[PDB]
GROMACS .gro file of C-alpha atoms in nm:
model
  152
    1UNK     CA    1   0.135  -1.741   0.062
    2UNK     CA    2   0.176  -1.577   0.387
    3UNK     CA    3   0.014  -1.239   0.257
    4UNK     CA    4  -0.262  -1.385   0.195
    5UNK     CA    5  -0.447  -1.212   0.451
    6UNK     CA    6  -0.320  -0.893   0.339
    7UNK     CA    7  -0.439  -0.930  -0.045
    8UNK     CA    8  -0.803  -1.054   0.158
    9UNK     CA    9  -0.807  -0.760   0.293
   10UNK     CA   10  -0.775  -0.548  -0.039
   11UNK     CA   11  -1.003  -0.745  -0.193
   12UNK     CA   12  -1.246  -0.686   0.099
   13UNK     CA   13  -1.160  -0.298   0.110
   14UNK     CA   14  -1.179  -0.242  -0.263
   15UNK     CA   15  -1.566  -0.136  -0.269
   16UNK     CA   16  -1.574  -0.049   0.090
   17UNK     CA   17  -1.631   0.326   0.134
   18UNK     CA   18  -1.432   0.479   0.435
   19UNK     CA   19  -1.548   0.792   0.419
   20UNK     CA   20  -1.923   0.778   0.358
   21UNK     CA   21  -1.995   0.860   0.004
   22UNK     CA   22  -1.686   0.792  -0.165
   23UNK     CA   23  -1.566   0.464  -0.251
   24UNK     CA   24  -1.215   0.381  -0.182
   25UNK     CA   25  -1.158   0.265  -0.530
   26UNK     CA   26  -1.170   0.628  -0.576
   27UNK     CA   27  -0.953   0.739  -0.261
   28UNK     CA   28  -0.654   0.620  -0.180
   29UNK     CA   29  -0.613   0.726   0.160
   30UNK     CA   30  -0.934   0.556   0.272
   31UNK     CA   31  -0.865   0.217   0.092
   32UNK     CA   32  -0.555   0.164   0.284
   33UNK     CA   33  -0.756   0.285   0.622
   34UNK     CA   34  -0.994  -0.023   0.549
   35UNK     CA   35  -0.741  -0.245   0.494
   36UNK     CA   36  -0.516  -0.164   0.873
   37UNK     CA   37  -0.919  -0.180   0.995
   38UNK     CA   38  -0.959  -0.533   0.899
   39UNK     CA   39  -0.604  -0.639   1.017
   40UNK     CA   40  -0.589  -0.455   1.316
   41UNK     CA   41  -0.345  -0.234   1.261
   42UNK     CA   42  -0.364   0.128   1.380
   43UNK     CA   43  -0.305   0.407   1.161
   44UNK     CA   44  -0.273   0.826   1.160
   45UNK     CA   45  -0.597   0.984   1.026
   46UNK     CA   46  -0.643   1.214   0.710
   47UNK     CA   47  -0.596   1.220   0.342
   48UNK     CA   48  -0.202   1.041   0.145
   49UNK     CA   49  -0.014   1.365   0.278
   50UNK     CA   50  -0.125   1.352   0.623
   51UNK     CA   51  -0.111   0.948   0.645
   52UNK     CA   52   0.233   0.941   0.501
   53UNK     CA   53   0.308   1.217   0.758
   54UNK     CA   54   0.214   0.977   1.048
   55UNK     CA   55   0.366   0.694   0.891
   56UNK     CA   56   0.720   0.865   0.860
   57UNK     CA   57   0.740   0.953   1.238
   58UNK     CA   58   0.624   0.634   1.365
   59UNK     CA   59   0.694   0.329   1.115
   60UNK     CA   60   1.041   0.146   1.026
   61UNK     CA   61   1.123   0.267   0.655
   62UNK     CA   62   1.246  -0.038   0.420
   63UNK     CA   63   1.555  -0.025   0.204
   64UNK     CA   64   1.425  -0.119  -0.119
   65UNK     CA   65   1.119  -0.194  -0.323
   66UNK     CA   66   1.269  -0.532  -0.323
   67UNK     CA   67   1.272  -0.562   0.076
   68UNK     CA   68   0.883  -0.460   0.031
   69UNK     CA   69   0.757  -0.686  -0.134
   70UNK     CA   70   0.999  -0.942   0.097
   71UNK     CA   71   0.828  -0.839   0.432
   72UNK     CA   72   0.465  -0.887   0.275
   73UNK     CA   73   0.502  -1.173   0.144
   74UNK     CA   74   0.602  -1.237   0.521
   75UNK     CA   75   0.293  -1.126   0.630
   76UNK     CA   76   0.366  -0.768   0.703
   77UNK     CA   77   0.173  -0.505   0.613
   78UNK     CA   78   0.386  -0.261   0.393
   79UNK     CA   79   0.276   0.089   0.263
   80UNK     CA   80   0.416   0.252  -0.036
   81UNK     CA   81   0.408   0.614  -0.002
   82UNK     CA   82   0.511   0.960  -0.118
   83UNK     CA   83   0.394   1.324  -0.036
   84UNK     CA   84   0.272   1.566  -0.275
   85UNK     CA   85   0.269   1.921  -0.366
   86UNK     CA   86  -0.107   1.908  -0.406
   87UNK     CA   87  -0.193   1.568  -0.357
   88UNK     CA   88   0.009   1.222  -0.206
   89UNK     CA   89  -0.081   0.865  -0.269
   90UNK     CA   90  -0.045   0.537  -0.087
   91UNK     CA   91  -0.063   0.175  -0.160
   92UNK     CA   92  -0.025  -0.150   0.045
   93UNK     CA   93   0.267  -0.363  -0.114
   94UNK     CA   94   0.224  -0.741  -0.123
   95UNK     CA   95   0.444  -1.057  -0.303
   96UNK     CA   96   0.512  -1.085  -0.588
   97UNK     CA   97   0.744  -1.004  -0.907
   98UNK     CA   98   0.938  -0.697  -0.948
   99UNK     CA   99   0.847  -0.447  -1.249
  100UNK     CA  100   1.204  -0.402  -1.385
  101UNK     CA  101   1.342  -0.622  -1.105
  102UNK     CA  102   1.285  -0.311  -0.887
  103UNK     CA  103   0.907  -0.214  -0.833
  104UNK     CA  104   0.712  -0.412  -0.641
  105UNK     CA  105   0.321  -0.521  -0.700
  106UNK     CA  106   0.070  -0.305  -0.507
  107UNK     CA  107  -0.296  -0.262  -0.404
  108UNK     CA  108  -0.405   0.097  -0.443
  109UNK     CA  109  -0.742   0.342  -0.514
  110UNK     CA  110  -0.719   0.663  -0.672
  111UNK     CA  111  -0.909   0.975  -0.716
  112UNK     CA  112  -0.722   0.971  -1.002
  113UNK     CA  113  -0.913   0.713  -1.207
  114UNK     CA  114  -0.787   0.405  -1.334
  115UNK     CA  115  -0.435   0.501  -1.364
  116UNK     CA  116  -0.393   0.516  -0.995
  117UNK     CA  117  -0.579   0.190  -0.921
  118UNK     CA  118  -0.446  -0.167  -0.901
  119UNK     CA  119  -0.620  -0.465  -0.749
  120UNK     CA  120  -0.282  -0.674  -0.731
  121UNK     CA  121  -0.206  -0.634  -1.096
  122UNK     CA  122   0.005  -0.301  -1.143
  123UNK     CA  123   0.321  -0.206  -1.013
  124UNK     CA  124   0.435   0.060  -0.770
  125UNK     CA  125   0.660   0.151  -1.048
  126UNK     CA  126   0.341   0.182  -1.305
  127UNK     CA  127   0.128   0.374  -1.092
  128UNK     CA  128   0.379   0.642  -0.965
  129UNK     CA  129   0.519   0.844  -1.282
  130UNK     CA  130   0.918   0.750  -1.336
  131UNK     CA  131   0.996   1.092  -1.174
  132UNK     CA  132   0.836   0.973  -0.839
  133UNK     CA  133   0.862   0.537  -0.872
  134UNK     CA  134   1.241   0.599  -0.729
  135UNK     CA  135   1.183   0.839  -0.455
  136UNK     CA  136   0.894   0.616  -0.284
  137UNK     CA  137   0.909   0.521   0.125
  138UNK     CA  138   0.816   0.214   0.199
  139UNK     CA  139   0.655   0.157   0.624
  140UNK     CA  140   0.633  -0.190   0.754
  141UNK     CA  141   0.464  -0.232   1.052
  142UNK     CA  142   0.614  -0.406   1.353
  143UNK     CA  143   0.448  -0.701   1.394
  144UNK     CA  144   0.318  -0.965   1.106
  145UNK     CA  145  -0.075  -0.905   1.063
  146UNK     CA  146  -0.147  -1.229   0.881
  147UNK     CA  147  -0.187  -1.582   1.085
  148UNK     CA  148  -0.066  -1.933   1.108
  149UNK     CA  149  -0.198  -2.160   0.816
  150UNK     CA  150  -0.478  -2.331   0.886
  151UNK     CA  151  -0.424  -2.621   1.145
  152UNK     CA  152  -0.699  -2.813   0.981
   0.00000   0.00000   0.00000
């Protein structure tokens, strides 16, 4: 239960707009901006290329999709992410079962439409085509975002 402020935060980011205009439902990039914003986490600017870019030269890469969805439900927060020719994508990773014991559960928007979005209910492994799903980073950042349980 320790992600639990992660998967608030996706829930709070989902029809938050980061760049004016365009709601991060419809941009990945910006839905994973909102959700560091609300934790506190500081991120490298731009669009999936540029933020998985950033993420590479500054963030500790995990093994395995496996070891993602470990450290969120820890209460890190994790980004899926892989460059692309034209365009990248990114997701945030939190608990929960592996797809094919492999692919963890995700948060992600998409300018893509609906098959690049998941509010908690695809997989990492579903919304990256099989030719990608295996070639994914995963960044953890280097402290835990979420709190203590409630004391009272």
């Amino acid at each position: 239960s320790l992600d639990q402020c992660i998967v608030n935060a996706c829930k709070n980011s989902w029809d938050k707009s980061y760049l004016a205009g365009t709601p991060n439902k419809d941009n990945c990039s910006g839905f994973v901006q909102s959700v560091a914003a609300e934790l506190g986490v500081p991120m490298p600017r731009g669009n999936a290329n540029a933020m998985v870019d950033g993420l590479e030269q500054s963030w500790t890469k995990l093994a395995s999709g496996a070891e993602a969805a470990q450290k969120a439900a820890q209460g890190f927060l994790v980004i899926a992410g892989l460059k692309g020719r034209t365009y990248g994508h990114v997701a945030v990773v939190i608990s929960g079962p592996l797809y094919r014991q492999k692919y963890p559960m995700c948060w992600c928007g998409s300018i893509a439409g609906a098959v690049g979005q998941s509010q908690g209910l695809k997989s990492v492994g579903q919304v990256w085509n099989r030719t990608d799903r295996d070639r994914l980073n995963y960044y953890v950042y280097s402290l835990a975002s979420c709190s203590l349980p409630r004391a009272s």
